[PDB]
Amino acid sequence: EELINMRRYRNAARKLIHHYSLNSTSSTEYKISDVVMTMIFLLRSEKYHSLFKLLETTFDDYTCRPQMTQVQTDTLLDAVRSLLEMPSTTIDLTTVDIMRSSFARCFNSPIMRYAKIVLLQNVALQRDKRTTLEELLIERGEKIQMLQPQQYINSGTEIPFCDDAEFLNRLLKHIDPYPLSRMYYNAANTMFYTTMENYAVSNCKFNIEDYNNIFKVMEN
Amino acid sequence: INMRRYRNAARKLIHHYSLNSTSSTEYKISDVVMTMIFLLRSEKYHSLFKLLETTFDDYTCRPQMTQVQTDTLLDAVRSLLEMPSTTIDLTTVDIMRSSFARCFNSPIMRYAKIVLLQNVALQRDKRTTLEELLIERGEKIQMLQPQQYINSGTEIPFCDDAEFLNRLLKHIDPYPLSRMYYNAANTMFYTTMENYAVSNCKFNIEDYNNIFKVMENIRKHS
Amino acid sequence: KVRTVTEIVNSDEKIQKTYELAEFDLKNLSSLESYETLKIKLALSKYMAMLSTLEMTQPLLEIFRNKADTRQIAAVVFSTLAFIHNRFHPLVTNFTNKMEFVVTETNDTSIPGEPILFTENEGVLLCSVDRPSIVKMLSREFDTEALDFSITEVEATQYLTLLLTVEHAYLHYYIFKNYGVFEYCKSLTDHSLFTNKLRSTMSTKTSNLLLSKFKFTIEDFDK
Amino acid sequence: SYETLKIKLALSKYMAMLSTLEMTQPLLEIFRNKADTRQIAAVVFSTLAFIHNRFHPLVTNFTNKMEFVVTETNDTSIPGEPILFTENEGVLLCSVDRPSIVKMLSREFDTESDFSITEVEATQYLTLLLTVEHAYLHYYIFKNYGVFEYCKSLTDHSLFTNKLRSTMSTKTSNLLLSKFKFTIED
């Protein structure tokens, strides 16, 4: 291309390309125009254009044959030499493969997206009034255990045999003569209230007789 | 030389940078390269191709097209988006060009640098402010009478047959839900920041942050 | 309808009470995904029904396009506003004040965010709209959803999206009505005050924003 | 009666344990706030140790190591099972719903130095302890019985019901829950 200042662009592209070599890494720096320029240049340079179109294999899982005549492979490597100084470390299929790997590690869909808002889904209920807590356990799957647990108090180990009179006996003076029965009644009320609510929230329903069995503690 | 595929990528890129970019993870450096190659192939579009390649921190002697040349350029643009229902102002395209300038000036790598900004490249050497919005003012509104008012189809209508409306609803049931929002509401009323095309007074995340604290009240107060 | 009984270590009889079935199904339905989806869809259906009653509302985006007739634009505005009025409260079904309305045709009127502008003087309440930008806003609605009556989802998209901004405007109008120019201006400087003012608003029914989140990356919220 | 005497005695000793080493909260219920980490576990661990040593005084020091997760979501939620514990590989790990606990402990309640105490708020201790008792049932079950019947019982609570371990007494008489009876009405 008239516009593309072929010599300048060639020089820049070569300097970029060298970064595949172990000694050169483009000083860990690049501008994406630097990469863009190279494909164009190769398209403008037929000696290379062949190799370039072949190196479309670099990013493309399906581009065409590897198998070319020995002479043809030299037809590629010689062009490589010409591009480079070719001072030593003679161009070889090893270099080819290293190049390909380097492109694979360079072109890896580096991001350029800018902005887009995000939503969430916050309703448990799906169509099953029947649900057992059992199958709800199957749902939960202890998936939460994927999440990191949190250290206990790390006090070590103790049993507080806290015999007392200084506080204790004055506490005893507040004998608190109240209908302990009816407070128990309220407690049980609220406890089944909790579980009933949570069932409703899950849309699970259950045999009350199981709760009756749960409570049925005392004998003799 | 899959010119076809390259074009196919290119059009997606065009929409992604211009408008209503509902797509996700559209970006791909190889794909934009294919775009540039397609441009080169597009002899007819060589004008635009050279304009686009020009994107660097110099940009003295902009294309300076004759209006005729600009019109032909827009013709190309519409013929290449193949969604010609509007001709966008050139300035949006130049803004996408500035984004491409950012792309060039980027030694940026595996790190997931989402651009995460509206580009400030719309400027005309002016400064703008929120209280200065009161100075942008509706003096013009005072200079204009409202066009008209009439009573026809007058007053207070009300709803039709519930059963017929359920009949209509059944056509609506199949459709997905909330993705409609995530397309339209999200994209559109984010990009409404385009209004800063008027000498780019800065956007302010803060009032947009209203949304959570305002909507929460529904659940917070049952 | 249910009852409950409890007993103690002593033989001293028992405590008893009753509990009411209704609440539990009430709440599970109040969390029943399908129920709420039905609610929002019903709202949209009601709006579109009103559109059908409104002179058999014609194809939307072009009807808004083309500068053909201010009349239909103004009618759309008025009817939508009355619809929102009714939804938020049917108790006070309408509002009398007649007025003309302004269309504007220039970027030079651009108000960021706000497309629609309430104003008043001399008792003449008025509102104003810049069609062009709104036309653009509606136009191009790919709505990819990739991830007999011709009632496509597509234009229904816009039919919904309008409602959001119209609701946003309804907020400001309500604020001005209750408190007038000072509060109205001070607020439309910044929407942030709305909840802090409207804490009283235990309204019977709920806003559209059910999806409960509209957020993006923390970055650039810099001090 | 002597029964009431011993009942309030055990109550008072529960207050004594509540006179905890740290007991640092200004609150009655840290759970009121999302922020806490350690005091939750402190309370829980302490109460568990107390219960176990009451069930038999034959324990020196309560096992030390443990680990915990806060749970505060409907996803986490398990109706009927506000609190959970397992010595997996012998290592105790445990979980408790902050909101589910609080939202009902705080519920409205019936009402028929000053150094003075209030019945309902005391009763909060009782109720929470009852939840701990329910947990401990399954805990002690699994302690000597395999995963199969353990997991089964987690639903068939009746499984342990109407089976003794040593005896119907089995020192359960020495546990306060024994003194209560209940039935759902028709």
Q: Is B28 on the interface with A (CB under 8 A)?
A: yes
Residue type, A125: L
Strand, coil or helix: what is C120? strand
Hey, what are D142's tokens? 């699994």
- Are the beta carbons of C212 and A122 separated by less than 8 Å? yes
- Quote the CA–CA distance of B169 and C39 in Å, as a whole number: 12
Verify whether the Cβ–Cβ distance A125 to C32 is below 8 Å: yes
CA-wise closest residue to C198 among C211, C183, C208, C214 = C183
C-alpha span between B92 and B75 (Å, rounded)? 16
Nearest-5° Cα angle at B58, B57 to B63: 120
- Distances in Å between the alpha carbon of C200 and those of B107, B217, C89, C217? 54, 11, 15, 32
A115 close to B114: Cβ distance less than 8 angstroms: yes
Secondary structure (3-state) at C5: strand
* Tokens describing residue D115: 């150094």
**What gap in Å lies between CA B74 and CA A196, rounded to an integer?**
67
Chains C and B touch (3+ CB pairs under 8 A): yes
Interrupted after residues, chain B (C–N over 2.5 Å): none
Residue B210 CA from chain centroid, whole number: 23
d(CA B215, CA A99): 54
C214, B20, B191, B109: which is closest to A112 by C-alpha?
B109
With beta carbons under 8 A apart, name residues in chain C contacting D186: 3
C102-104/C124-130 β-pairing: parallel
- CA separation, residue B196 to residues B19, B97, C222, D144 (Å): 15, 18, 20, 71
Token pair 């994927």 is found at A146
User: Is residue B163 classed exposed, middle or buried when 0-12, 13-18 and 19+ CB atoms within 10 A define those classes?
Assistant: exposed
Q: Do B24 and A113 touch (CB under 8 A)?
A: yes
Token pair in block for residue D21: 């080493």
Touch between chain B and chain D: 3 or more Cβ pairs under 8 Å: no
Q: Are D95 and D71 spatial neighbours (Cβ–Cβ below 8 Å)?
A: yes
Query: What sign has the CA pseudo-torsion D116, D121, D123, D124?
Result: negative
Q: In sequence order, what are the beta bridge partners of C19?
A: C2
Contact C85, C94 (CB under 8 A): yes
Parallel, antiparallel or unpaired: strands C15-19 and C102-104 = unpaired
Grouping H, G, I as helix, E, B as strand and the rest as coil, residue A151 is strand
| Contact yes or no for C36/C210 (Cβ under 8 A) | yes
> Could you give the 3-state DSSP secondary structure of residue A10?
helix
d(CA C156, CA C83): 17
Q: Distance between CA atoms of D151 and B5, rounded to whole angstroms?
A: 58
Pick from C102, C97, C94, C95: which is nearest to C118 by CA? C102
Phi and psi torsions of C121, nearest 5° = -155, 160
Quote the tokens at residue D64: 């030390």
Residue C137's contacts (CB-CB under 8 Å, 6 or more residues apart) are B188, B189, B192, C115
**Ramachandran sector of residue A26 (left: φ over 0; alpha: ψ -120 to 50; beta: rest):** left
* SS3 call for C121: strand
Dist. CA B164–CA C223, nearest whole Å? 55
CB of B161 closer than 8 Å to CB of B169: no
> Which is it for the CA torsion B117, B121, B127, B132, positive or negative?
negative
Q: Test D107 with A191 for CB contact under 8 angstroms.
A: no
Specify the experimental method: cryo-EM
Q: Which helix (H) or strand (E) holds C15?
A: strand C15-19
CB C127 within 8 A of CB C102: yes
User: In 3D, which of B70, B193, B200 has the Cα closest to residue B124?
Assistant: B200
What are residue C102's DSSP bridge partners? C128
Neighbours of chain C (3+ CB pairs under 8 A): A, B, D
C-alpha distance from B140 to closest chain A C-alpha (Å): 35
The whole-angstrom distance between D185's CA and the closest CA on chain C is 5
> Cβ of C15 and A127 within 8 Å?
no
For residues C50 and D97, what is the distance between their CA atoms, to the nearest angstrom?
47
What 3-state class would DSSP assign to A26?
helix
Report helix angle D119-144 to D38-55, nearest 10: 70
Name the CA dihedral angle for C190, C193, C195, C201, rounded to a multiple of 10 degrees.
Answer: -110
Map chain B to HEC letters.
CCHHHHHHHHHHHHHHHHCCCCCCCCCCHHHHHHHHHHHHHCHHHHHHHHHHHCCCCCCCCCCCCCHHHHHHHHHHHHHHHCCCCCCCCHHHHHHHHHHHHHHHCCCCCCCCCCCCCCCCCCCCCCCCCCCCHHHHCCHHHHHCCCCECCCCCCCCCCCCCHHHHHHHHHHHCCCCCCHHHHHHHHHHHHHHHHHHHCCCCCCCHHHHCHHHHHHCHHHHCC
Tokens 């029943």 correspond to C32
> Cβ atoms within 10 A of the Cβ of D48, count?
21
Interchain contact, D161 vs A216, CB within 8 Å:
yes
Two tokens at B109?
Answer: 């790598």
Contact assignment for A160 to D155 by CB distance below 8 Å:
no
* D70 bridge partner residues: D96
Q: Measure the CA dihedral C157/C163/C164/C166, to 10°.
A: 140
Q: In one letter, which amino acid is C141?
A: E
Task: Give the three-state DSSP class for A95.
Answer: helix
CA distances from B202 to B124, B188, B192 (A): 14, 18, 13
Closest to B108 (Cβ–Cβ): which among A39, A53, A110?
A110
Handedness of CA A25, A29, A33, A34 (dihedral sign): negative
Residue of D nearest to A151 (CA): D67
* C145–B180 C-beta distance less than 8 A: yes
In this structure, which long-range contacts are made by residues B42-46, counting pairs with CB atoms below 8 Å and at least 24 apart in sequence?
A: B44/B76, B45/B76, B45/B80
Q: Which residues pair with D87 in a beta bridge?
A: D92
Sheet strands side by side (includes C2-7):
C15-19, C2-7, D181-184
* C33 vs A contacts (CB less than 8 Å): 123-126
Tell me the H-state helices in chain A.
6-17, 32-44, 46-54, 70-83, 93-106, 133-140, 168-173, 180-202, 208-215
Helix, coil or strand: residue C6: strand
- Torsional class of A146: left (φ above 0), alpha (ψ -120 to 50), beta (otherwise): alpha
Do the Cβ atoms of B171 and C94 come closer than 8 Å?
A: no
Residue D134, number of CB atoms within 10 A of its CB: 20
Cβ burial of D178 (10 Å; 0-12, 13-18, 19+) is middle
The residue count of chain A comes to 220
Is C9 close to D184, i.e. CB distance below 8 A?
A: no
Residues 6+ apart with CB under 8 A from B46: B39, B40
| Cβ–Cβ under 8 Å, residues C73 and C129 | yes
Measured between CB atoms, does B118 come within 8 Å of chain A?
Answer: yes
Contact D134, D48 (CB under 8 A): no
Integer Cα distance of B130 and B136 in angstroms: 10
Q: b vs e for A40-66, b when ≥16 Cβ sit within 10 Å of the residue's Cβ?
A: bbbbbbeebebbbebbbebbeeeeeee
CB A36 within 8 A of CB A12: no
- For residue A61, the distance in angstroms to the closest alpha carbon of chain B comes to 13
> What angle is formed at CA A20 by the lines to CA A17 and CA A24, rounded to 5 degrees?
85
Residue listed under structure tokens 């999200």: B186
Contact C31, C39 (CB under 8 A): no
Give the distance from CA C223 to its chain's centroid. 33
CA separation for the pair C88, C169 (Å, rounded): 13
From the list A155, A159, A198, the residue facing D79 with the nearest CB is: A198
- The overall longest dimension of chain C from CA atoms, in Å, is 88
Which helix (H) or strand (E) element contains residue C177?
helix C153-188
Inter-residue contact B48 to B39 (CB < 8 Å): yes
> Would you call C3 an interface residue with chain A, using a CB distance cutoff of 8 Å?
no
Handedness of CA A30, A36, A41, A46 (dihedral sign): positive
**Measured distance CA(C72)–CA(A99) in Å, rounded:** 65
Q: Residue type at C95?
A: F
> Sheet harboring C124-130: ordered strands across?
C102-104, C124-130, C116-121
Q: Which residues contact A18 (CB under 8 A, 6 or more apart)?
A: A24, A26, A84
Cα B99 from Cα B96, distance rounded (Å): 5
Q: Is D2 exposed, middle or buried (0-12, 13-18, 19+ CB in 10 A)?
A: exposed
Q: Rounded to whole angstroms, how far apart are CA atoms B115 and A114?
A: 4
C17 sits in which H/E element: strand C15-19
Please answer whether residues C16 and C33 qualify as being in contact, where contact means their C-beta atoms are separated by less than 8 angstroms.
no
Task: Count CB neighbours of B142 within 10 A.
Answer: 10
CA D160 vs. chain centroid, Å, equals: 18
Phi, psi (degrees; rounded to nearest 5) at C15: -115, 145
Q: Is D185 on the interface with C (CB under 8 A)?
A: yes
Return the HEC string of chain D: CHHHHHHHHHHHHHHHHHCCCCCCCCCCCHHHCCCCCHHHHHHHHHHHHHHHHHHCCCCCCCCCCEEEEEECCCCCCCCCCCEEEEEECCEEEEEEEHHHHHHHHCCCCCCCCCCCCCHHHHHHHHHHHHHHHHHHHHHHHHHHCCHHHHHHHCCCHHHCCCCCCCCCCCCHHHCHHHHCEEEECC
Q: Torsion angle of alpha carbons B171, B176, B180, B182, nearest 10°?
A: 170
In this complex, is the C-beta atom of D158 within 8 Å of any C-beta atom belonging to chain C? no
Q: CA angle, corner B174, sides to B173 and B175, nearest 5? A: 95
Q: Which residue of D has its CA nearest to C7?
A: D181
- Nearest by CB to C15, which of A117, A126, A185? A185
Q: Tell me how far CA of residue B122 lies from CA of A42, B57, B94, in angstroms.
A: 35, 16, 9
Give the nearest partner residue to C216 out of A115, A126, A203, using CB atoms. A115
Resolution in A: 4.8
- In this structure, are residues B149 and C98 in contact, taking their beta carbons and an 8 Å threshold? yes
Q: How many whole angstroms separate alpha carbon A212 and alpha carbon D182? A: 8
Q: Which residues make Cβ contacts (< 8 Å) with residue B13, sequence separation at least 6?
A: B26, B31, B32, B35
User: Cα separation of A1 and B53, whole Å?
Assistant: 12
* Structure tokens, D46: 């302490």
Cβ partners under 8 Å of residue C167, min gap 6: C84, C207, C208
Name residue C199's beta-bridge partners: none
